[PDB]
Amino acid sequence: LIRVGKNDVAVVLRVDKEKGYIDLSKRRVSSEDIIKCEEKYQKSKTVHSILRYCAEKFQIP
Amino acid sequence: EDRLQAVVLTDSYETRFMPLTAVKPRCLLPLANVPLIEYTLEFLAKAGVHEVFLICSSHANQINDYIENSKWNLPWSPFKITTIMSPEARCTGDVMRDLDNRGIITGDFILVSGDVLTNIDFSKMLEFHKKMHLQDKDHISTMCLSKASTYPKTRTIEPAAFVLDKSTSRCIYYQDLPLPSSREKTSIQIDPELLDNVDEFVIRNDLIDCRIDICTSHVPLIFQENFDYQSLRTDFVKGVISSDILGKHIYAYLTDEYAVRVESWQTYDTISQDFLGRWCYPLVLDSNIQDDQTYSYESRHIYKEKDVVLAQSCKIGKCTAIGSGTKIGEGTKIENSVIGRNCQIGENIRIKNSFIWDDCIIGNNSIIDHSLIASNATLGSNVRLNDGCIIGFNVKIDDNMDLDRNTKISASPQDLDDQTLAVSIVGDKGV
Amino acid sequence: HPNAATSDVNVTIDTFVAKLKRRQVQGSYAIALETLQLLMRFISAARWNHVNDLIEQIRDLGNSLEKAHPTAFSCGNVIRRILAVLRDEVEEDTMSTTVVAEPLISSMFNLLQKPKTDYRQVAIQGIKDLIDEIKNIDEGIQQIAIDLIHDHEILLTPTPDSKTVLKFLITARERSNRTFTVLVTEGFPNNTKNAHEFAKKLAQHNIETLVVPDSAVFALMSRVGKVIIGTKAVFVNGGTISSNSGVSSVCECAREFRTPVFAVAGLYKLSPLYPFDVEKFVEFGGSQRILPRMDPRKRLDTVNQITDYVPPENIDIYITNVGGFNPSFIYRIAWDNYKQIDVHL
Amino acid sequence: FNITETYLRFLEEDTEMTMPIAAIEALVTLLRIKTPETAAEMINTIKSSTEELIKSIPNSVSLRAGCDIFMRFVLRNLHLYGDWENCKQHLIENGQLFVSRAKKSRNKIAEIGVDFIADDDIILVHGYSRAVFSLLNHAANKFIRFRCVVTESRPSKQGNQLYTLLEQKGIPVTLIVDSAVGAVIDKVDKVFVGAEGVAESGGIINLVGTYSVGVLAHNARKPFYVVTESHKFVRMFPLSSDDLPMAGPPLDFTRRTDDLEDALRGPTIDYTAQEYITALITDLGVLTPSAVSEELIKMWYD
Amino acid sequence: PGISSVIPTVLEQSFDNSSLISVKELLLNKDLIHPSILLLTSHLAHYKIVGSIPRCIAMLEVFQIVIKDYQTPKGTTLSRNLTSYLSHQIDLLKKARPLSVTMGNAIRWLKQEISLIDPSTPDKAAKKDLCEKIGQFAKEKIELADQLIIDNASTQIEESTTIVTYGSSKVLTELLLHNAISLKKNIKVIVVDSRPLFEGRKMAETLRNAGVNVMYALITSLDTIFNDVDYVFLGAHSILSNGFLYSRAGTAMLAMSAKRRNIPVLVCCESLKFSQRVQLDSVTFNELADPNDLVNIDYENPVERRGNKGALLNQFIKERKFEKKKLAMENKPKGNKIGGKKGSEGESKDASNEE
What we know:
By secondary structure, chain B is of the alpha/beta class.
């Protein structure tokens, strides 16, 4: 089902706010929450796309 | 049917091989560590020859000496060699005229231009020629043609477009093109003199030149009559077609099997490669024709003569032939290249698709790629050669040299760069 | 030794060489016949005065012939036989000229310990005898051959190129009481047409014929009863050179399934020289027959061979004109036909 | 804290510590310091450590097998979806517990799977394994007609060691060179072998000479046996007859020397095919035919 | 209604159980059949390229196309005559060229799908989701699996290789191509060709189209080709419940040869090709074709020579029969590359119960 490229669900279990170690989970998802998570991810992706063309255009960070 | 004489057009295509042919004759040069004349002779024998005639002018003494040394000189031969000695530099018309003046021509005489080696049986062809002759009184000469490698791409010098009939096997038009080499004339021509008589028109280009001719007694007379024809393919055939003498027939034999004549350098290389492989059905070096030869067959298309020494741990590719009296060192990578007789190879040498002639020393830590080295020319330490680099007679390539693609080296000790003396031109040294 | 001595006395040597080189002569039998003829010519025409010298000359000639063509074993064999025939007579003569005990027909210790006549006629007779032997082989096989095959048994036939094997099959098939099913392997690059011809012949003879491709040998192997080889040349230890393509793999398969492997050839095909190398004696075919075009075929280097070599471990029976023999016994037969010194020339 | 150091710590003792069990214990010890609650900080680090160990390996195979087994166990552990603490505690417990288990397994093997040698069956033993020796000693303990044949093992004179071990038990023994092994199959009944590891295909990863022995057994139809403690299942596939992930050279043709220096570089690890095995003796039931592969499948769920 | 009876050539004495006859040129059929199925059948009957792997994919594609084109009648429900249609299609396929194990599996899957959704849902919503699901399935169990296999192979290949190969198996072609391009090792490819289908030739052509050093051989020429050469690879059709290799023509002999000459064989297979049907010989069920394939005299497929042979019916007592699918021995292949990375062929039905 997963393999390469396909969108897959995540929720933050444990955070190490010192050096950089992030724990993620798929089964914990709050039931239909999976769908919501997916939607959020999609939104994020779209936002990223939006702030990529402008970065390349005006040559700004 | 029996008793047929042979006339071989030798020493005709000199200076076509631009670096070589200046000191020694053209035909005497080895194909695969053994002279090119021998193959031709063998072919003639196979066909059915009763007397041999050779045309010599450029370095004739050497040719004579070779003949004297050759096997056919002894009384056991069915055919004897008597050479035609003529004044220097003349066309095939002039030669024909000279022949006519002498007068040995009887019946169906064999005229072969250049040197050809092919596997196809000739008796059947002869029979066909006879039968066709028996059809009508005014029949002239036979031409040999073979099916090409599907599409033509490596043929630029002689890519002849043959418009042919299926019922009679007769040529309609002959034309030469520089189309793949230079984009100036990508062109086709058809004449309307034989449109409403043949009907069955087949336009073809993919046919390779052989230049073996079975000729009647009419041909020399014709040559004598019309002195304007200096060549035999470009002007002659066309003339015949356009009715110079009215109501006459010519032949174009079609064969599915391999038949190619020697013409250039790349073509020569290809021919050699074919010979190395099992392209020609009975023509193999291991049979030993010259009697002094001691060739034997081995696995994966590898030829080894007697007294051949090769050192341990040397990875070989595909199709390799080694001549007698060789000493080869360690750490060599040999791929699709022929090594000459009594050649001394050093250590750590990478070879790919190259060609090495009789008695050559290859220096330590050198790379040879798709390039030819002639007889008694030596390679020194650290020499890097690219595709199609012809090296002439006795050229001493010493220590440290680099030559780029398609660099030709002179043979006689003129116009082309790099000379026979010490070091090839990177620092100016020579005559 | 060159051909300086023989030029006007004997001329046919050159013709023989020509026949050998360009393959104008076909079939080992024909080659043998030619060799015999040559020998006869040599005998009738030339002068001798001495015997040892003559023998030496003969040896030299043989060597030359070998050098001219290595795949012609029959030619060599016949010569060797003739030499052997000569040798015994010479030995006999020596005993009379001078004017011995042996446990068997030949002794080993005689080599270690220190040891004009009408021999020409005898030599001539030898050639005739050889010719006669060559003439009929199948008549001396069939009395042993039609005893092995039984009712409801299945035969498998690699190499249908040999003329003897077909005859042997036909003789077996003649019998009304005997019934057998025939599976025929094709052999693609060298044997196809011949195989087809064989199949046609079988059909004509009114026998159940099954034409099998080279890939479909494995599926039918549970039913296979016997294996027959169409070999061309027999040797010392047991190993044989077969008449082109599709023999080795089949033999291996037979060995795996423990299927009996028979061989029918003859003693004129039998050689006293050892096959030390497969690469030296086996000759390769043609690349042109397999695939069309030339320019892309420079990249595509195709491997194809004529003759096939099978190890003596797989083959168990060698029925000839004399009788049934083994690979562990055939050496002695060769010795009975070719002498000790005549092996190396 | 180091695993390598821990491994080094055991040298002269052993002979019951199943090296892999020791390795597992070491791994557990390494784990139970830097908080096993987080998976981001821990599993990756464990993997790195394992990689380091692999890099540092002189001539050992089973370590990898052990580590992957441990990993699998860990993975299995967090499927209960309960809480992070209790599960962690359980995991921690399961290291010493695992070690404890090995002894029990050995006992099980030595009491149940020893019935092969009973009616004075002459045994041909090669390849040193502790389990086989235990079986032998505990058969002597039980008292049974039995005889031993020893084939000479030469990595660094291990055969002698084996002989000495045999001696401290009371039983007549003889030495046989692995060249004359083809000559003697007549009086010797069955062939027994101790393995370094069992392959994915089914075959055995062993020592200086086993394939030849297997071949001989096949020829003679006298059965070939392998006795090992059930934890030597590595994800490794010997595809051809002369290929293994080996630390030593695989048949190196040394250059022309004069002083006789480079010679002893012969194959110290050999592999035999899957068909040669008649019975494989393991603690997790008497199973042989395609059992290892099944186990592997169960582990990887693929 | 279709066409029945009339079979060319002799029926022979042995090996008579499976269909070998039939429509080659169409004459009078039922006026309701979608032409794409017919076209596919026509292709399969006279195919020279396909070999186990792509056929199933093609079938799936065809099914998808049919679904896309499918319109529900106003009277009857979505599944009433659909099943009948499917049956008819199956019958046509069988008449043309017998169904494979993969095809059977596909059919089973389709049946399952049909059972899953009961006739209650509208047209445009159901099939929208069905086609997507099927696509997803295809992506999962086929292409991805193939990729995985390729990657497994990649790590398994060592340094300095000389390989002898056979078949028109797409996976093997992919593998070899990968080796040639992205790995950049010292790979040598030797090709073996067969009489019924020019698969070897196709493989060679493909290799040429990449630029690989190629030796070209046949089933007969094998005794001299070894005399350096190590690896041998084969293409499998399906593995049965016994564990035996139920594959195409010239494989088993090659395997045997390999076994004889020291070095073992490696075969590749998918994690769906496994069958519950039990057989241990080629006699049980075999792909048998018309003797028209064994007519051409060497060289090329389209030549047509009037040589020696060209008759079958007129000949009295003559049996010219050939087999396409074979059953190779169990112990001879050692390596099997499936969905679960690596494993032995003796596992047989470990994935069948797993589903």
